[PDB]
């Protein structure tokens, strides 16, 4: 259910930084981010119309760490729901418990957050939730349980988050180790580099 291989490779393939590593060390020092992975990295072939969309889709999938069938399901759900489809999909992706945790700053990477979720560290409304794909609702408090509160990794993650830009749609407490999912995030709150529309188009043929 997870990708287990090299993480920076994926980023290289994409072109952009996907936040796949914590960010203590800069991405440019740790890998050749501009060069594609493999023997034929130096060559940059001209990509087809289908191709670019596919790449974009992969980028988004990589970002969240979501496998294809689940992604398809998410897309379908977005389509079903009223309003903007790509936007809806993005919102759904955000809703993911692990992603929420990452945003809050309990996980240094999203992978770390996912791990935490798996290992029973995370409580949603005073209930220990184990699934990363759990859709967090508005006005839902999500906290670290007292067993996992003594973890040094968690504090490091928090510190890292403090350095990074904080989300408007969340309110997080460092000392209490709890966060409030205020509202489902808007498109303007999220990154502009993501071209959701291409992804939408892709799943229409």
């Amino acid at each position: 259910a997870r990708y287990l291989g090299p993480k920076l490779k994926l980023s290289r393939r994409e072109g952009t930084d996907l936040f796949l590593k914590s960010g203590v060390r800069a991405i440019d020092t740790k890998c050749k981010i501009e060069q594609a992975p493999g023997q034929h990295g130096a060559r940059k072939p001209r990509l087809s119309d289908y191709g670019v969309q596919l790449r974009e889709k992969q980028k988004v999938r990589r970002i969240y760490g979501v496998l294809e069938r689940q992604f398809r399901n998410y897309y379908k759900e977005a389509a079903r729901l009223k309003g903007n489809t790509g936007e809806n999909l993005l919102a759904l992706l955000e809703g993911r418990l692990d992603n929420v945790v990452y945003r809050m700053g309990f996980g240094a990477t999203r992978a770390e957050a996912r791990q935490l979720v798996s290992h029973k560290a995370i409580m949603v409304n005073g209930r220990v939730v184990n699934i990363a794909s759990y859709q967090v609702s508005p006005n839902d408090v999500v906290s670290i349980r007292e067993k996992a509160k003594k973890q040094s990794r968690v504090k490091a993650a928090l510190e890292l988050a403090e350095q990074r830009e904080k989300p408007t749609w969340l309110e997080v407490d460092a000392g209490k180790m709890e966060g409030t999912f205020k509202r489902k995030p808007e498109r303007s709150d999220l990154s502009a580099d993501i071209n959701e529309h291409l992804i939408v188009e892709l799943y229409s043929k």
Binding site: D49, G83, N84, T85, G86, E87, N88, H197, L198, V200, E201, S204
Partner: protein, 156 residues
């Protein structure tokens, strides 16, 4: 400000006493991402020169299209040669649902939300022309009000 992209480049032949002389035909389309749309069809012995020619052609002979909030105003048919085209406006978030050359021309135009289909022949040059024709013919509410001698609120 002007976004420009090549649709299709094809090698064409002229036959002579010696053998065949090969030329390249490049079909490009330009748009400002608002109302203006223009296609270009350039031809040279080399590809890049041909593409340049096409671009030049596209830059002149442009056509203004009435767009409502980044989409079409009404369902519209467009015809040229064998290529008979249909395109329909859609709710925001649906994306550009169009095939081949069509997709390109819509993107440069600045439409973001369409459901479109090409019937009959699907020859790139013809189909793009058809699409452009369709775009041209499509009128706005204001325009129709002007034509009928009425207000926009009376027609809705």
């Amino acid at each position: 400000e002007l976004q420009e992209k090549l649709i299709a480049v094809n090698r064409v032949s002229k036959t002579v006493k010696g053998g065949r002389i090969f030329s390249f035909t490049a079909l490009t389309v330009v748009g400002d991402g608002n109302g203006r749309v223009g296609f270009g069809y350039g031809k040279a012995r080399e590809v890049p020169a041909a593409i340049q020619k096409a671009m030049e052609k596209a830059r002149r002979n442009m056509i203004n299209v009435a767009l409502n909030n980044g989409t079409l105003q009404h369902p519209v048919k467009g015809v040229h040669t064998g290529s008979r085209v249909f395109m329909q406006p859609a709710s925001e978030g649906t994306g550009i649902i169009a095939g081949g050359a069509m997709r390109a021309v819509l993107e440069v135009a600045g439409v973001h939300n369409v459901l479109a289909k090409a019937y009959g022949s699907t020859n790139p040059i013809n189909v793009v022309r058809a699409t452009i024709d369709g775009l041209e013919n499509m009128n706005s509410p204001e325009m129709v009000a002007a034509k009928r001698g009425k207000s926009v609120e009376e027609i809705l």
